[PDB]
Amino acid sequence: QHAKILAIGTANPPNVYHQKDYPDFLFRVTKNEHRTDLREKFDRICEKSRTKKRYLHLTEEMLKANPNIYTYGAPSLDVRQDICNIEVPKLGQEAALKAIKEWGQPISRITHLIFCTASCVDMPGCDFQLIKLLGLDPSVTRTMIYEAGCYAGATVLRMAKDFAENNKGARVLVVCAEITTVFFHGLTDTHLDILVGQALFADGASAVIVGANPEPEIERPLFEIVACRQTILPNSEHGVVVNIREMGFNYYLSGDVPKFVGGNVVDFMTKTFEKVDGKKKDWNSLFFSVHPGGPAIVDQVEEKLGLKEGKLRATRHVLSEYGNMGAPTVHFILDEMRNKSIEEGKTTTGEGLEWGVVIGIGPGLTVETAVLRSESIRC
Amino acid sequence: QHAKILAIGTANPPNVYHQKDYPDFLFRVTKNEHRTDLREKFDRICEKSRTKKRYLHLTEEMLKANPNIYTYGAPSLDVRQDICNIEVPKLGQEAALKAIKEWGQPISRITHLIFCTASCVDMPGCDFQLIKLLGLDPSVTRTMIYEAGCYAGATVLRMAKDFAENNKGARVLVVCAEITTVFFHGLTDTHLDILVGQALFADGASAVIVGANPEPEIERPLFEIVACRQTILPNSEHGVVVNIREMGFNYYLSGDVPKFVGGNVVDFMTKTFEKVDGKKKDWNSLFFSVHPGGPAIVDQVEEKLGLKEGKLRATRHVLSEYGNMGAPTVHFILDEMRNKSIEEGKTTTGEGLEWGVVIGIGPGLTVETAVLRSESIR
Ligand SMILES: CC(C)(COP(=O)(O)OP(=O)(O)OC[C@H]1O[C@@H](n2cnc3c(N)ncnc32)[C@H](O)[C@@H]1OP(=O)(O)O)[C@@H](O)C(=O)NCCC(=O)NCCNC(=O)CCCC(=O)c1ccccc1
Numbered sequence: 001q002h003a004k005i006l007a008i009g010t011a012n013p014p015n016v017y018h019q020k021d022y023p024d025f026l027f028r029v030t031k032n033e034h035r036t037d038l039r040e041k042f043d044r045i046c047e048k049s050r051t052k053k054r055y056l057h058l059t060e061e062m063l064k065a066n067p068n069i070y071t072y073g074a075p076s077l078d079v080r081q082d083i084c085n086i087e088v089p090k091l092g093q094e095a096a097l098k099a100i101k102e103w104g105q106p107i108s109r110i111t112h113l114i115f116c117t118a119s120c121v122d123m124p125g126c127d128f129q130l131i132k133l134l135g136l137d138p139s140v141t142r143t144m145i146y147e148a149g150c151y152a153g154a155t156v157l158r159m160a161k162d163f164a165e166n167n168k169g170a171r172v173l174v175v176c177a178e179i180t181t182v183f184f185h186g187l188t189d190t191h192l193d194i195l196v197g198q199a200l201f202a203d204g205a206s207a208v209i210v211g212a213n214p215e216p217e218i219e220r221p222l223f224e225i226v227a228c229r230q231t232i233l234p235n236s237e238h239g240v241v242v243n244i245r246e247m248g249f250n251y252y253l254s255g256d257v258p259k260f261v262g263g264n265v266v267d268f269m270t271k272t273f274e275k276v277d278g279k280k281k282d283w284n285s286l287f288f289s290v291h292p293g294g295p296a297i298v299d300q301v302e303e304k305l306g307l308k309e310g311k312l313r314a315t316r317h318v319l320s321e322y323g324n325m326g327a328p329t330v331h332f333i334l335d336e337m338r339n340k341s342i343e344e345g346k347t348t349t350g351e352g353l354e355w356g357v358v359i360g361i362g363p364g365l366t367v368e369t370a371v372l373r374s375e376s377i378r379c
Numbered sequence: 380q381h382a383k384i385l386a387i388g389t390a391n392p393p394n395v396y397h398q399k400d401y402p403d404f405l406f407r408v409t410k411n412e413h414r415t416d417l418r419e420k421f422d423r424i425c426e427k428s429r430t431k432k433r434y435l436h437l438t439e440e441m442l443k444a445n446p447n448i449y450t451y452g453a454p455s456l457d458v459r460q461d462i463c464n465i466e467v468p469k470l471g472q473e474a475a476l477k478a479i480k481e482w483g484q485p486i487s488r489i490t491h492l493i494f495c496t497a498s499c500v501d502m503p504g505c506d507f508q509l510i511k512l513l514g515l516d517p518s519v520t521r522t523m524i525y526e527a528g529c530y531a532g533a534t535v536l537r538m539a540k541d542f543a544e545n546n547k548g549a550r551v552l553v554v555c556a557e558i559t560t561v562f563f564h565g566l567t568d569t570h571l572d573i574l575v576g577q578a579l580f581a582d583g584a585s586a587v588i589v590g591a592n593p594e595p596e597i598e599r600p601l602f603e604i605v606a607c608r609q610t611i612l613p614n615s616e617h618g619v620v621v622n623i624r625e626m627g628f629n630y631y632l633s634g635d636v637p638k639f640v641g642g643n644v645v646d647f648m649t650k651t652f653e654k655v656d657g658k659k660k661d662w663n664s665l666f667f668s669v670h671p672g673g674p675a676i677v678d679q680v681e682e683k684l685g686l687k688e689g690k691l692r693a694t695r696h697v698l699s700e701y702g703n704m705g706a707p708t709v710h711f712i713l714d715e716m717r718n719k720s721i722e723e724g725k726t727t728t729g730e731g732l733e734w735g736v737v738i739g740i741g742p743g744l745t746v747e748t749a750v751l752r753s754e755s756i757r
């Protein structure tokens with residue numbers, strides 16, 4: 001009896017930033033309208049981003065009150081943390097309440113909490129703050145995952161699987177929440193990577209309830225977590241770096257990240273499915289939730305696995321409507337897939353297909369995969 | 380077939396700071412010899428610390444090169460991280476190689492890595508850096524626990540138990556490493572909590588190998604991880620606070636922490652053992668690894684559980700010889716207990732007793748307990 005996802009909820013900050021307006025906003029509020037050279041480059045990136053809108057906690061009023069946030073390299077960690085240490089658990093709470101509603105059990109049945117964020121760090125942590133906000137049992141068993149990065153949406157499902165399967169009756173609440181205020185930086189041609197993050201990074205939270213042995217007539221599984229694998233892609237340590245600094249969370253992104261993903265995807269898919277059935281080809285038989293770190297990563301997975309037109313629709317839809325929200329994103333994609341499958345009258349939550357995969361990609365470069373089975377559509 | 384601890388290794392930085400000498404050192408290198416009132420208070424805290432010596436990576440030359448480290452509130456996180464992000468994995472590597480030696484199996488047999496530190500944070504993390512240093516399989520399954528705090532020496536055993544028990548054949552390397560350079564702060568009469576940390580906090584690393592179903596005549600267990608419980612002590616959110624700031628990792632410690640531990644120990648012990656036995660426990664029948672957050676915390680456990688003289692000897696020995704090294708400390712204590720049990724010709728690794736407990740205590744306040752069984756010395 002494998003661990004099942006029993007519920008998914010999501011949440012975002014209320015302020016919507018349409019991509020068509022974001023270059024004007026960014027260059028105005030950071031006092032960079034004279035940088036027409038960088039504006040040209042940013043326009044090109046935004047046009048390629050395949051991101052139509054994003055939800056962001058950060059406002060112009062926050063930047064006016066804390067101009068060090070947009071002054072490249074100036075001290076600003078403290079103001080960023082004072083925001084994110086509050087907003088990350090709050091956004092997580094909103095998603096968690098939606099997951100708990102779908103699940104339909106009392107909060108007292110939650111035995112385990114996994115909280116994951118790369119947007120802040122504090123002691124006590126976000127897990128403790130969420131317990132307070134939700135009224136979880138003081139004796140919930142907690143795992144607090146700080147600063148793992150963009151593979152962690154798959155990682156938390158792997159962790160929840162082991163906790164749910166080894167602890168009989170356990171019910172694991174998994175919350176991933178991101179507020180990118182800590183990653184916002186000003187513009188300099190010495191650090192062009194910031195233009196990519198300024199185009200793609202976004203705010204959001206997911207909540208997933210995981211448990212083995214669903215209770216008949218109360219609980220309803222959406223997906224089964226079958227097998228997982230984590231691996232480091234060779235010779236790619238420079239791919240994604242984030243340093244926690246006095247200036248905030250400073251990030252460096254190599255232009256070679258998409259090529260590294262495409263050069264390794266057949267291998268990491270083959271080795272993952274070796275844990276299940278030995279699948280080694282015909283990847284279109286699966287459903288997919290691919291972390292959309294950028295559109296070029298999604299395109300590389302599509303090309304090298306030979307995926308047909310539309311196979312990655314749910315992944316692309318989330319990227320378009322929300323951007324790259326970090327770890328929560330693959331859970332938004334699973335929820336979108338479930339929603340569209342209901343809309344289309346499919347026989348399962350995975351686009352009518354039986355088997356699928358979640359692909360998380362982050363620093364290392366590290367890829368974590370989780371093989372899933374879908375479930376029949378009911379309640 | 381519960382998960383078992385198959386090996387324990389430990390490491391510390393090379394520089395020894397005897398407590399008798401530390402007040403003179405601290406007040407000299409931080410240019411505070413004029414503060415006679417603070418010196419007198421610090422002397423009193425050190426005399427009560429029950430800590431004889433500590434190992435620290437930080438040196439006077441480092442302070443001279445980076446005086447913002449001892450200038451209270453000055454920006455210094457970047458220099459601290461540049462040190463700790465290197466030194467934490469390096470110290471962890473030393474402890475891990477010792478655990479791997481005892482275990483006796485190839486590094487390629489490790490399937491899972493848990494790395495825990497409250498002393499730094501970076502992406503890729505310490506787990507990635509340790510994989511590089513040791514040559515672990517690039518497909519090891521990793522859990523990177525950053526900034527959990529002083530309960531995590533029990534937490535990592537709980538996590539390792541689940542990973543080892545749910546994955547046939549899995550072998551989990553667990554590494555906890557601390558370098559307190561990030562927590563060093565100068566002296567101000569407005570933040571007296573710093574005098575406590577300056578007296579007690581210290582550097583060290585532990586490594587444990589965990590697996591279920593040890594191979595007969597190849598692997599041998601030291602302890603079995605039976606059951607675990609994590610709980611938040613009521614109305615104690617202000618007990619321990621650590622904020623990651625431009626000035627480093629700033630911390631606040633309530634003087635009520637010992638009383639909170641004492642007020643909850645019967646309850647958390649009772650509820651933990653209810654997971655293993657329907658009969659009530661005689662606390663003196665157990666062996667103990669108690670996180671020595673300070674001597675008063677150890678005293679509160681002894682007092683409220685009615686523990687006999689000598690029951691907490693291993694705990695107090697590690698506090699005396701190493702100070703409070705954070706999450707690794709409870710593993711140093713288990714290693715000391717196993718070593719002393721060999722010296723004394725005891726029948727088990729737990730002082731000749733069958734059942735025992737690891738008590739981790741940290742922010743929340745949060746207590747995590749792990750019920751252990753000992754093993755025969757083999
Ligand atoms: C960029 C597009 C769309 C360009 O679209 P395309 O490539 O199709 O078009 P293109 O080739 O014309 O490029 C157009 C111009 O962008 C230039 N350019 C390209 N890449 C550049 C680079 N890396 N640095 C500098 N310039 C670059 C190039 O050089 C060209 O410049 P020019 O136009 O001047 O020639 C495409 O490449 C693409 O999706 N990429 C992959 C992006 C990637 O890795 N995401 C991983 C992100 N995860 C993290 O950050 C983790 C850390 C944050 C975190 O924890 C976190 C937490 C919470 C929430 C969120 C995040």
Ligand SMILES: CC(C)(COP(=O)(O)OP(=O)(O)OC[C@H]1O[C@@H](n2cnc3c(N)ncnc32)[C@H](O)[C@@H]1OP(=O)(O)O)[C@@H](O)C(=O)NCCC(=O)NCCNC(=O)CCCC(=O)c1ccccc1
Nearest residue numbers: 423427557571572580632633634636672673674675704705
């Ligand atoms: C302090 C002793 C020994 C005093 O010994 P006793 O109590 O027996 O003697 P005592 O009563 O005479 O006190 C003598 C004078 O210390 C004064 N004093 C007392 N406590 C004070 C306080 N909190 N603030 C200000 N002043 C205080 C009092 O006010 C008196 O001042 P005066 O002498 O001027 O009157 C005793 O109490 C005791 O073990 N306590 C428990 C200490 C405690 O919580 N450890 C938890 C530590 N974990 C963390 O930090 C986690 C965060 C760091 C971290 O992640 C980390 C990572 C990696 C490695 C390491 C750490």
